């Protein structure tokens, strides 16, 4: 070790090799008439099948003493259970299949976005397709970078919280719909506006916090491609894990605050 930090490996084709930026918001892969399949939907399937396979492997021959995949699955599930019970101890059972799967889907979606080939591998500086007459559309885009997936999660969560806020405390909802006297009347409209904002805020938060990370990884691959984006690879791993956990946490916290 010593002080052998030379960083000469960092001085390898600083910006001549990789393309300039090459980023976009959403694209279409199609492949079937009717539904315009996207690259995000491809990952949203390759993660869904991955999660299902992981579940089958973990629950394969459930033993009394945990081992391996069963053990880590039990640890994750019970940690999430305790985390949600810390907020509300009554609706954990009902809200768990949705909130836990939000976490388990968003986590693997974000972590798949850092797999090699997310932007390098695609279909029809100059990459490869650009040598031909057709543009290079990238495959394997992280699903959380899609505004059709994050908004789907947000609207599902909003429907869930509204359903369980109307199934409890009665259909009054006088705290936000309308109040007769006091400053609570003025507070109610602001609360309604915030509640309407809430799914938009959640979807925009997830989509931005993943898309900006992917764009950062690509652009810092553009300049000094080797050994410089390692700390930011780590930071984006952590940010993916966070944005996975906090989405679940916020869904359950909003559910609890709606019930109360």
């Amino acid at each position: 070790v010593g002080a052998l930090i030379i960083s000469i490996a960092s001085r390898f084709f600083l910006y001549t090799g990789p393309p300039h930026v090459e980023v976009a918001a959403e694209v279409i892969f199609d492949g079937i008439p009717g539904f315009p399949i996207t690259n995000s939907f491809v990952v949203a399937i390759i993660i869904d099948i991955f999660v299902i396979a992981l579940a089958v492997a973990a629950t394969r021959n459930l033993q009394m003493v945990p081992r391996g995949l069963q053990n880590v699955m039990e640890f994750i599930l019970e940690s999430l259970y305790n985390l949600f019970r810390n907020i509300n101890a009554k609706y954990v059972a009902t809200a768990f299949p949705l909130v836990a799967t939000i976490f388990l889907f968003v986590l693997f979606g974000n972590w798949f976005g850092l797999l090699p080939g997310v932007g390098s591998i695609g279909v029809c500086i100059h990459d490869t397709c650009a040598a031909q007459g057709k543009k290079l559309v990238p495959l394997f885009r992280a699903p959380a970078a899609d505004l059709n997936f994050t908004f789907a999660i947000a609207v599902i969560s909003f429907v869930f919280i509204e359903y369980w806020g109307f199934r409890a405390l009665g259909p009054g909802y006088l705290k936000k719909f309308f109040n007769t006297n006091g400053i609570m009347s003025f507070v109610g409209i602001i609360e309604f506006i915030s509640e309407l904002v809430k799914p938009f805020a959640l979807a925009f938060r997830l989509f931005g916090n993943i898309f900006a990370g992917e764009v950062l990884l690509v652009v810092m691959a553009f300049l000094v491609p080797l050994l410089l984006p390692l700390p930011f690879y780590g930071f984006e791993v952590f940010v993916g894990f966070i944005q996975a956990l906090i989405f679940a946490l916020l869904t359950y916290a909003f559910l609890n605050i709606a019930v109360t």
Partner: protein, 49 residues
């Protein structure tokens, strides 16, 4: 919109997510929750005697 929002794609993603929710509830969530409650009930039975 130019930001890639399409109702059919959003509906397809919602359907995929719901199918994931139900499958995971019937494949991982129920068995693992059953095992955890089994462990807790075994602990309670042991501390009973």
């Amino acid at each position: 919109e130019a930001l890639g929002i399409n109702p059919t794609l959003f509906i397809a993603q919602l359907i995929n997510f719901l199918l994931l929710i139900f499958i995971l509830r019937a494949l991982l969530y129920r068995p693992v929750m059953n095992l955890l409650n089994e462990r807790t009930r075994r602990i309670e039975e042991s501390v009973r005697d």
